[PDB]
Short mmCIF file of C-alpha atoms in Angstrom, two decimals:
data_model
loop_
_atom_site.label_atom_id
_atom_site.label_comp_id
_atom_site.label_asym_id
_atom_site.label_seq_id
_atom_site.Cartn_x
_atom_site.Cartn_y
_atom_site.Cartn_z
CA UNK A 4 0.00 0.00 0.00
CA UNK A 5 3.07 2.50 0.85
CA UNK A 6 5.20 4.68 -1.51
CA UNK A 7 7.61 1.47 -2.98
CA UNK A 8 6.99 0.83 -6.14
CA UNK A 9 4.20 0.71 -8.04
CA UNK A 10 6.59 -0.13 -10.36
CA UNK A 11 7.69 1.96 -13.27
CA UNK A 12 9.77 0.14 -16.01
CA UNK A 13 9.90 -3.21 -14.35
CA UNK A 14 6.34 -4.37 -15.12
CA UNK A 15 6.68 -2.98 -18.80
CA UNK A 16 9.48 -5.29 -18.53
CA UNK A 17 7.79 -7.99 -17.72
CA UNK A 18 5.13 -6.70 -20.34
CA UNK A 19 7.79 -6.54 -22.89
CA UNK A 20 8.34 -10.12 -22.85
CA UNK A 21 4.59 -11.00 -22.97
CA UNK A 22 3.90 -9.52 -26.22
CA UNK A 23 7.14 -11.25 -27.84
CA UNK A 24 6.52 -14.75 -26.16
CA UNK A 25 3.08 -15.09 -27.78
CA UNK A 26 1.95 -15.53 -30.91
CA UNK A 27 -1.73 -13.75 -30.88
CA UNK A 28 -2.12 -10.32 -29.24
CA UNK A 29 -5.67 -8.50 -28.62
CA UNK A 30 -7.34 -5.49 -27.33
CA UNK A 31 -10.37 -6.51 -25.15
CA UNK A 32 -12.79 -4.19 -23.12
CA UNK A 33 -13.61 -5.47 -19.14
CA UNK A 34 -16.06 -1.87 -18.53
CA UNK A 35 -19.22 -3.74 -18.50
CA UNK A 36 -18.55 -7.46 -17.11
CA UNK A 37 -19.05 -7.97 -13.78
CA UNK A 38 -16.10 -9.78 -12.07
CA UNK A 39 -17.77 -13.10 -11.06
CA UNK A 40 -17.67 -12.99 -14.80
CA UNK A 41 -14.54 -11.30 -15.28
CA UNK A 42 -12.74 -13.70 -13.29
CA UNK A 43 -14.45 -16.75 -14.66
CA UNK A 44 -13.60 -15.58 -18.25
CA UNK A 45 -10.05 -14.75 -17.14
CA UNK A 46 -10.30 -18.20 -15.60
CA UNK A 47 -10.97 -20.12 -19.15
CA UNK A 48 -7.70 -18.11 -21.16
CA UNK A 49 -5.67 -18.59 -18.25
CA UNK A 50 -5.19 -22.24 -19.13
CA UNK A 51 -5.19 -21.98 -22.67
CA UNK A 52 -2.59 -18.59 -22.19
CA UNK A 53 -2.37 -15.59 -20.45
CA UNK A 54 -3.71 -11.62 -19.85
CA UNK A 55 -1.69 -8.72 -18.36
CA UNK A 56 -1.28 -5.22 -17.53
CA UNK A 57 -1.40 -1.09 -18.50
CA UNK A 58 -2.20 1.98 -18.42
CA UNK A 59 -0.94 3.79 -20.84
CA UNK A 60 1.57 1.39 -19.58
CA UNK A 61 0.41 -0.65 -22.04
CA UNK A 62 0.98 1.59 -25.07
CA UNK A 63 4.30 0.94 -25.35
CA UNK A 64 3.12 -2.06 -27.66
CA UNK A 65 6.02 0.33 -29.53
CA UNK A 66 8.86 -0.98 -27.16
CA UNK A 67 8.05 -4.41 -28.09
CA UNK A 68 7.71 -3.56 -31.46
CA UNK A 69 11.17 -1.88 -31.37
CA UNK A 70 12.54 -4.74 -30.12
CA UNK A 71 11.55 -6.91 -33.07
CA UNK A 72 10.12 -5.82 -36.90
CA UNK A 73 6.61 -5.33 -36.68
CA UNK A 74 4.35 -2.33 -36.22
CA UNK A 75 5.02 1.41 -34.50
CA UNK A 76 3.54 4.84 -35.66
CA UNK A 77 2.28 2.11 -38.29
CA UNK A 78 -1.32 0.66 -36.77
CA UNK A 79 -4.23 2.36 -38.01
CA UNK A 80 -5.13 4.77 -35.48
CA UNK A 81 -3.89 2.88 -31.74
CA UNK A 82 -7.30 1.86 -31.36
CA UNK A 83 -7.28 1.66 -27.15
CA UNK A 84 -10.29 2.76 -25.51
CA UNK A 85 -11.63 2.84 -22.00
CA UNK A 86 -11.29 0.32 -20.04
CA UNK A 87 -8.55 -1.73 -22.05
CA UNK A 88 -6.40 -5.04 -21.48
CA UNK A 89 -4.09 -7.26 -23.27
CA UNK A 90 -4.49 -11.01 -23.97
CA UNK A 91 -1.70 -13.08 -25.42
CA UNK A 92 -2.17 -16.79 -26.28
CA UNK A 93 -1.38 -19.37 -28.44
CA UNK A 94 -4.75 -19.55 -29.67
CA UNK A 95 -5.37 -18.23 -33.49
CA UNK A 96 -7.63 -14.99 -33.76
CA UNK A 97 -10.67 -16.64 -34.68
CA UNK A 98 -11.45 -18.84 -31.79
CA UNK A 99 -10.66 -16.81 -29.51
CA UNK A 100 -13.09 -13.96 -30.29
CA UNK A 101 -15.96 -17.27 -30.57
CA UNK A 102 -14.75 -18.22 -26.81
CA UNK A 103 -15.07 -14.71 -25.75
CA UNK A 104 -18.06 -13.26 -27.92
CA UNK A 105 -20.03 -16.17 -27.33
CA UNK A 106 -19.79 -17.14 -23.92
CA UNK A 107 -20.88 -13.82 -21.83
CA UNK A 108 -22.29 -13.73 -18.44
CA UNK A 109 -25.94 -12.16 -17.91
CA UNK A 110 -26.15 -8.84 -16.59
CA UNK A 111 -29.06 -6.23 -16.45
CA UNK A 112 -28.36 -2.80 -18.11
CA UNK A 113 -27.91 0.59 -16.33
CA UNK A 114 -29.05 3.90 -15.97
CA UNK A 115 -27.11 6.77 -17.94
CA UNK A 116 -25.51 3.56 -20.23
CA UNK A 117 -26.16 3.53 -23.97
CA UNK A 118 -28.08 0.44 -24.98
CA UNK A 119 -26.04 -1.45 -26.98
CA UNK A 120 -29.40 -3.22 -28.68
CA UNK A 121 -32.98 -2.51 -28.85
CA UNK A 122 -34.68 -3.01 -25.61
CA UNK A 123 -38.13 -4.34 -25.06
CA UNK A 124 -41.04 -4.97 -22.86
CA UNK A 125 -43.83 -7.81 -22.99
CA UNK A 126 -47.22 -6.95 -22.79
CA UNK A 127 -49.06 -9.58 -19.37
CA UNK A 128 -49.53 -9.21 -15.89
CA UNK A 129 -46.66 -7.58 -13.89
CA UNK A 130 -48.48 -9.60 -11.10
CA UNK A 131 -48.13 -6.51 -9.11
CA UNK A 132 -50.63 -5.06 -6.80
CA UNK A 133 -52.11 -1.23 -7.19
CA UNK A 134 -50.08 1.33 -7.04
CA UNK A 135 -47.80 4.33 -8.55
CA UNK A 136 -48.36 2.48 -12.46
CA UNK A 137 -47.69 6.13 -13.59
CA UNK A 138 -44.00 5.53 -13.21
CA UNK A 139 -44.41 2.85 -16.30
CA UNK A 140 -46.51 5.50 -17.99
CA UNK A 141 -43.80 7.82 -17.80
CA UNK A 142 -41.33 6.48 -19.66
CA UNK A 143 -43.79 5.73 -22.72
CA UNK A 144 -44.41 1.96 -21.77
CA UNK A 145 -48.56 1.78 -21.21
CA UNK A 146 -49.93 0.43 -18.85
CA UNK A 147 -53.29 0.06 -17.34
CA UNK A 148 -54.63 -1.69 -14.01
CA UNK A 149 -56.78 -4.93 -15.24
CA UNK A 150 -58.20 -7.57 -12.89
CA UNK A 151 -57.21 -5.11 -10.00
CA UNK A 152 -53.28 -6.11 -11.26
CA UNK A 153 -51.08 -3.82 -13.20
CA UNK A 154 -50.47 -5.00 -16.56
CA UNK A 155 -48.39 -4.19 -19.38
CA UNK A 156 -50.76 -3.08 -22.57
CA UNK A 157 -48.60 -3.78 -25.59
CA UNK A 158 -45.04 -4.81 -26.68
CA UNK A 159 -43.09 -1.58 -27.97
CA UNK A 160 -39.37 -0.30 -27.88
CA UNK A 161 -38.52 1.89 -24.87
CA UNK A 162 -35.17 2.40 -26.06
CA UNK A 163 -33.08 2.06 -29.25
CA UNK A 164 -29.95 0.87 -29.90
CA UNK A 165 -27.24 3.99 -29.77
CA UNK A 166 -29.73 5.88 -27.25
CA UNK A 167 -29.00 6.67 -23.78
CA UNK A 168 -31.04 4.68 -21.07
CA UNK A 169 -32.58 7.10 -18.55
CA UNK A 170 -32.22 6.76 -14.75
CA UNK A 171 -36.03 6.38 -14.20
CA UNK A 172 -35.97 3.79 -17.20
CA UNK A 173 -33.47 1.53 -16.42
CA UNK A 174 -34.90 0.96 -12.62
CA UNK A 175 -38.58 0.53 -13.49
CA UNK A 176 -36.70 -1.98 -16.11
CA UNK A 177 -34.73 -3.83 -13.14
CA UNK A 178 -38.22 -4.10 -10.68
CA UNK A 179 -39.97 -6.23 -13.69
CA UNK A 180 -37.38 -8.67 -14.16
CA UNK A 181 -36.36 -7.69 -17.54
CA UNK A 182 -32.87 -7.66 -17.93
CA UNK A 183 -31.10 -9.14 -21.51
CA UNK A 184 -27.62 -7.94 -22.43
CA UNK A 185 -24.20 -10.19 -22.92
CA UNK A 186 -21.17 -9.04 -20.52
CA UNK A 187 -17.64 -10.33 -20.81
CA UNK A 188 -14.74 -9.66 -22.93
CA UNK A 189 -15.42 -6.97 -25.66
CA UNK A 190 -12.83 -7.85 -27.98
CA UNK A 191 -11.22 -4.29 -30.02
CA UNK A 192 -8.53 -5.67 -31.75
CA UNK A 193 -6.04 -8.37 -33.05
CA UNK A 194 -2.72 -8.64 -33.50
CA UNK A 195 -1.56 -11.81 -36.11
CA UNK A 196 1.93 -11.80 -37.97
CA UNK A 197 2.02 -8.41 -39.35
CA UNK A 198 -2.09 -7.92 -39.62
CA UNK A 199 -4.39 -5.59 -37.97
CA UNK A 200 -8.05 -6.87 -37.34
CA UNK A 201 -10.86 -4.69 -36.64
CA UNK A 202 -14.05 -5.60 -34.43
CA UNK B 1455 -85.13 9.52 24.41
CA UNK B 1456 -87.90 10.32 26.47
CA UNK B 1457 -90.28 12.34 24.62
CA UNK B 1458 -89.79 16.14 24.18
CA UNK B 1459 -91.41 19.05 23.12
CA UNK B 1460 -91.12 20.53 19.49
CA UNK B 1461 -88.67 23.38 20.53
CA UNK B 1462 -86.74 21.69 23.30
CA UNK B 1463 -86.08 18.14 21.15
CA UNK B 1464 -84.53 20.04 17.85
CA UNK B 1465 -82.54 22.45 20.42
CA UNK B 1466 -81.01 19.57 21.94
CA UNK B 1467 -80.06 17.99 18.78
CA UNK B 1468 -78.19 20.77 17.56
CA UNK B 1469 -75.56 20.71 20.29
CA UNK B 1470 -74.67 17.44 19.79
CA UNK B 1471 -74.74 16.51 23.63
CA UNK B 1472 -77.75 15.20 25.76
CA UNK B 1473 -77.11 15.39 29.56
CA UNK B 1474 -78.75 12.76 31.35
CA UNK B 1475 -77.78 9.80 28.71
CA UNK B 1476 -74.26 11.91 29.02
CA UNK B 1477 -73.38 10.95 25.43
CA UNK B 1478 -71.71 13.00 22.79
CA UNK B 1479 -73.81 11.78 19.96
CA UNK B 1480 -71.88 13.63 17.22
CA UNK B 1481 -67.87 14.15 17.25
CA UNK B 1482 -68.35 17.80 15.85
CA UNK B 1483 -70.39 20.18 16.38
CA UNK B 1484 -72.65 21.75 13.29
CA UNK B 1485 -71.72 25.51 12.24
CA UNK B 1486 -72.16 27.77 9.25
CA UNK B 1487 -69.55 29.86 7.78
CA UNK B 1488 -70.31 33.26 8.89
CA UNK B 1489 -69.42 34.72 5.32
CA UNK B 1490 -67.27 37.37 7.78
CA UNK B 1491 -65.01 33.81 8.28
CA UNK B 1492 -64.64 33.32 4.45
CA UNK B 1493 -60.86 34.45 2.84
CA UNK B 1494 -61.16 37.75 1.24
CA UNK B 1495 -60.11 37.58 -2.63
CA UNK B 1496 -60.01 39.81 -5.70
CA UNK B 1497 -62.12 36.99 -7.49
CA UNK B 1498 -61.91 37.29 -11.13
CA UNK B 1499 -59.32 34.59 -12.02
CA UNK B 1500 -59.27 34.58 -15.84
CA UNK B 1501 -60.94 37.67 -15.48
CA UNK B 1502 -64.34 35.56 -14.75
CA UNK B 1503 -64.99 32.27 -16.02
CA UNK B 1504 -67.17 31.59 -18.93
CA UNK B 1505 -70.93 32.55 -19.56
CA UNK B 1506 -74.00 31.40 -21.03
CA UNK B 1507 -76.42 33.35 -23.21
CA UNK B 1508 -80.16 32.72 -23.05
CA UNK B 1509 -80.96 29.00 -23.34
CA UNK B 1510 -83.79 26.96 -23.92
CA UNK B 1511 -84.59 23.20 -24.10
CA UNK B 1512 -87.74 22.34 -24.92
CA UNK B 1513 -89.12 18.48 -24.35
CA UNK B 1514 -92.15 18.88 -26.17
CA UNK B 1515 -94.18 18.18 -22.89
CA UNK B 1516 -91.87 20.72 -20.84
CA UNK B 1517 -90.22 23.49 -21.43
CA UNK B 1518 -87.57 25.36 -19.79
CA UNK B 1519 -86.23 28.72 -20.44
CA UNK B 1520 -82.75 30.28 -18.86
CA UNK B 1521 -81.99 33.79 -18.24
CA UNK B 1522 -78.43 34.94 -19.70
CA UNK B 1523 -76.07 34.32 -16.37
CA UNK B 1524 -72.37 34.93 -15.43
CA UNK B 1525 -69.98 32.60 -14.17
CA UNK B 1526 -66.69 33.21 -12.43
CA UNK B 1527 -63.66 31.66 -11.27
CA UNK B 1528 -63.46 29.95 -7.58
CA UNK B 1529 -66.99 30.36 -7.07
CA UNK B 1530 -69.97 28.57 -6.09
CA UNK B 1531 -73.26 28.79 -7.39
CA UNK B 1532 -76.51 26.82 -5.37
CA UNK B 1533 -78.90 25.74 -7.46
CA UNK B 1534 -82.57 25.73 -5.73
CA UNK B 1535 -86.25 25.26 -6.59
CA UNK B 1536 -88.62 22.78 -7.08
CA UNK B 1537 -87.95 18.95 -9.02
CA UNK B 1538 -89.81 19.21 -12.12
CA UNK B 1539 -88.35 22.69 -13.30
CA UNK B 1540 -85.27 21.88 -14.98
CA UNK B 1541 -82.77 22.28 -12.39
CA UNK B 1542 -81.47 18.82 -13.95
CA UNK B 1543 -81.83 19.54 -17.66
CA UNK B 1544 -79.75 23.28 -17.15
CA UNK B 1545 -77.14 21.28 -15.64
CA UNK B 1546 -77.06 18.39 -18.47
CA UNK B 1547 -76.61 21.18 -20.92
CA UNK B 1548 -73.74 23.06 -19.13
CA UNK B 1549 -72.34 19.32 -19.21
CA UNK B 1550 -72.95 19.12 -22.51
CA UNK B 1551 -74.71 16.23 -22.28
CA UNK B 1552 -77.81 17.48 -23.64
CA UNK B 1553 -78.47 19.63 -26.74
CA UNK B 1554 -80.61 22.81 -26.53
CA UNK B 1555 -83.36 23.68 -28.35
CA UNK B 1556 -81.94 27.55 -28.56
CA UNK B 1557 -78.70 29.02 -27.50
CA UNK B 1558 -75.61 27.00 -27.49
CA UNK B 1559 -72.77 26.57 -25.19
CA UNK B 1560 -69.38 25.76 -26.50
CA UNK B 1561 -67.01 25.54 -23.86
CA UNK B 1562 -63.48 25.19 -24.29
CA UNK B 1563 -63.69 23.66 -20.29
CA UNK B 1564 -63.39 20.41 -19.07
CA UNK B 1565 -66.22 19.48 -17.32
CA UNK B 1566 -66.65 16.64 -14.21
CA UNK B 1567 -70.25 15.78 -13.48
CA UNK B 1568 -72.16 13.84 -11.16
CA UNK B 1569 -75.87 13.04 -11.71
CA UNK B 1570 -78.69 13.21 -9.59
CA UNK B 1571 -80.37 10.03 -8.69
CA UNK B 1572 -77.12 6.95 -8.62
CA UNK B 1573 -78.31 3.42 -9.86
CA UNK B 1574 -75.75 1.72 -11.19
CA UNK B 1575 -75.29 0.57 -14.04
CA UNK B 1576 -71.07 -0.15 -14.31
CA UNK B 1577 -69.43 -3.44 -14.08
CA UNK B 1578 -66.56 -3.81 -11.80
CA UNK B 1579 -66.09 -3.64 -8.42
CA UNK B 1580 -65.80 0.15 -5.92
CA UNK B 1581 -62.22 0.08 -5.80
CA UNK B 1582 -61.69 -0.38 -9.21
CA UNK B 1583 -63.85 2.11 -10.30
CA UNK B 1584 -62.76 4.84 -8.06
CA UNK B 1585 -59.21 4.41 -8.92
CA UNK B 1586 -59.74 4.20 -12.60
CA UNK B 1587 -60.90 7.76 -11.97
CA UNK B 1588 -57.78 8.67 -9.47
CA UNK B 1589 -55.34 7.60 -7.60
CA UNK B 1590 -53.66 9.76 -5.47
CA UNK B 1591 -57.27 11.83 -4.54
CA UNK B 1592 -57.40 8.37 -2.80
CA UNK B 1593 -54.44 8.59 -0.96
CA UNK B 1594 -55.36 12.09 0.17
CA UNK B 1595 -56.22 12.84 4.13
CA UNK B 1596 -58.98 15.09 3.28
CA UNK B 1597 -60.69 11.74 1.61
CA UNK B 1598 -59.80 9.66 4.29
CA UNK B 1599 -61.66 11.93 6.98
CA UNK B 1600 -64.68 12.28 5.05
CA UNK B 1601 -64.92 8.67 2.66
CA UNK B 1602 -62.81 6.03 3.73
CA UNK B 1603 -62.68 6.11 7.60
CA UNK B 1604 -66.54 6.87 8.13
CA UNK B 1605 -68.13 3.71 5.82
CA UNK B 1606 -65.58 1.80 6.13
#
């Protein structure tokens, strides 16, 4: 917890060595997964080969680079965006982003977060008793009180893809049950013998 | 009680108290706003509400004739007289309910209404009904003196 390092140029050194050792390099994106599901994920690679560490620590992708003949300067645009690791294994591109992509853990959404797909609600009974069903109203989902239950009138889209999820909609959202997204790994990039993959 | 004269009997019943039973019949007491008691307010509002012209509405059997009235904002307005004499229809037309024979009355208002003699004729049960109408007027503690506590 004190002052000693923390360390500056010995864990790039160690990072130096990870990019060099392994074959298959990518960019992946933790911010959503939870870390029951982080960990888990982590858990599956970890046998198969290995993630670690940066900051901007981590750009220095460079260093390596330096070290060998491969990219600088080169890449596209260094595509590293919030939230950012490094995984290196033996395992080719492909499979990787099919063990990853795939496999997610569940997870409801969250207020102020952009939905990443269209979201919907079922029409039926919420099975819930009388009581502030205006909250529902508000956000545009209707809803009416029928056999002295409140119950959803109609299936509709309270929020796009690419459109922000408001506070009030996301936890009238969470008290029905509704949930739906796929956490885990958000794969940015690859790395293969001289070749840049995007998403 | 025991029995009581004309005067004395209707005296007693007014206070809300007899003595030798010793029970107060009535939590409250019964009193009339003074009209010195009432708030004192420049009453306009909208400067005054809407008004009617001269109406008429004529059954063919009955016929019932209205005098060109005001109306203004925060007010109240008793309606008296004998059954019979259109008291009902005026108020069916101001709802818009009915049609006149003469005059008109377009308002751009929302009106609530509540008719005179209650049979009913809507399926569903009390609760349902009344909170179809509002909720929240329900959860009020002005409605729970007067409607929920009392009946029960």
């Amino acid at each position: 917890m004190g002052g000693i390092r923390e360390k500056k140029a010995e864990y790039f050194a160690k990072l130096r060595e990870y990019l060099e050792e392994y074959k298959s390099l990518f960019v992946v994106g933790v911010d959503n997964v939870s870390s029951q599901q982080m960990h888990e994920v982590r858990k599956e690679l970890r046998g198969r080969a290995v993630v670690l560490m940066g900051k901007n620590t981590m750009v220095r992708r460079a260093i390596r680079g330096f070290l060998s003949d491969l990219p600088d300067f080169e890449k596209l645009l260094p595509f590293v965006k919030g939230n950012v690791g490094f995984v290196f294994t033996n395992e080719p591109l492909t499979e990787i982003k099919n063990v990853i992509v795939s496999n997610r853990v569940a997870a409801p959404a969250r207020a102020g977060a952009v939905a990443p797909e269209d979201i919907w609600v079922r029409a039926v009974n919420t099975g819930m008793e009388p009581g502030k069903t205006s909250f529902f109203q508000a956000l545009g989902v209707p809803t009416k009180i029928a056999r002295g239950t409140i119950e959803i009138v109609s299936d509709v889209k309270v929020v796009d893809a690419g459109n922000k999820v408001g506070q009030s909609e996301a936890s009238l959202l969470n008290l029905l049950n509704i949930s739906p997204f796929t956490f885990g790994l958000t794969v940015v990039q690859v790395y293969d013998n001289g070749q840049v993959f995007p998403s | 009680t025991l029995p009581a004269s004309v005067r004395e009997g209707i005296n007693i019943f007014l206070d809300g108290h007899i003595p030798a039973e010793n029970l107060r019949f009535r939590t409250e007491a019964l009193q009339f706003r003074i009209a010195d008691a009432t708030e004192d307010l420049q009453n306009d509002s909208a400067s005054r509400a809407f008004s009617y012209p001269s109406l008429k509405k004529t059954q063919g059997d009955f016929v019932l004739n209205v005098e060109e009235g005001e109306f203004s904002d925060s007010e109240i307005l008793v309606m008296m007289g004998e059954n019979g004499t259109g008291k009902t229809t005026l108020i069916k037309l101001l709802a818009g309910a009915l049609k006149p024979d003469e005059g008109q009355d377009i308002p751009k208002l929302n009106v609530s209404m509540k008719p005179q003699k209650i049979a009913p004729k809507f399926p569903g049960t009390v609760r349902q009904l009344f909170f179809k109408k509002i909720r929240g007027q329900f959860l009020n503690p002005q409605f729970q003196t007067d409607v929920v506590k009392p009946l029960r």
